[PDB]
Write a protein that binds this ligand. Structure first.
Ligand SMILES: Cc1c(N)ccnc1CN1CCc2cccc(N)c2C1
Length: 150
């Protein structure tokens, strides 16, 4: 009864979250996950500003309306060598990572660790935040409000 949430640096408040290091988050779970970080799914405009501050990943994740990958450097294995906010057009499947937006974060690059999941609710799950530098924070709780996600 354990969930790992791997989180990135924030860029203009936007960050990437993956669950157990594999694509495994539904659209409903993504919204709930961001809410647990006192965050929201980013708008396209928010994500484009994050990109302009240095944000890129090699992973599909939800934003409010689309599934995207922010890309600064062309890479043939990430978003078919595209740059900019690459939008996923055609897929059979529904589970990705997510992006989240925290308005209270610093305006540019914030590569400090995340040490809390402030808006998690009471629950039985051991939830571990895992930073890219390995730094961890664990707590017992839950964040999923839809039964189909559990
Ligand atoms: C690189 C990679 C992959 N090959 C498959 C799935 N996910 C990733 C990206 N992950 C890799 C693992 C990890 C651990 C802690 C924080 C962060 N941000 C990350 C980012």
């Amino acid at each position: 009864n354990q969930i790992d949430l791997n989180v990135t640096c924030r860029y203009a408040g936007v960050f990437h979250v993956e669950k157990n290091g594999r694509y495994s988050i539904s659209r409903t779970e993504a919204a709930d996950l961001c809410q647990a970080f006192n965050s929201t799914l980013p708008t396209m405009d928010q994500m484009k500003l994050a990109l302009s501050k240095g944000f890129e990943t090699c992973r599909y994740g939800f934003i409010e309306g689309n599934v995207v990958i922010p890309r600064i450097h062309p890479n043939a294995i990430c978003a078919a060598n595209h740059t900019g906010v690459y939008i996923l057009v055609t897929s059979n499947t529904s589970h990705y990572d997510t992006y989240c937006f925290n308005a209270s974060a610093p305006p540019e690059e914030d590569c400090t660790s995340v040490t809390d999941l402030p808006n998690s609710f009471d629950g039985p799950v051991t939830i571990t935040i895992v930073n890219r530098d390995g730094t961890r924070y664990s707590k017992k709780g839950e964040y999923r409000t839809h039964q189909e996600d559990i």
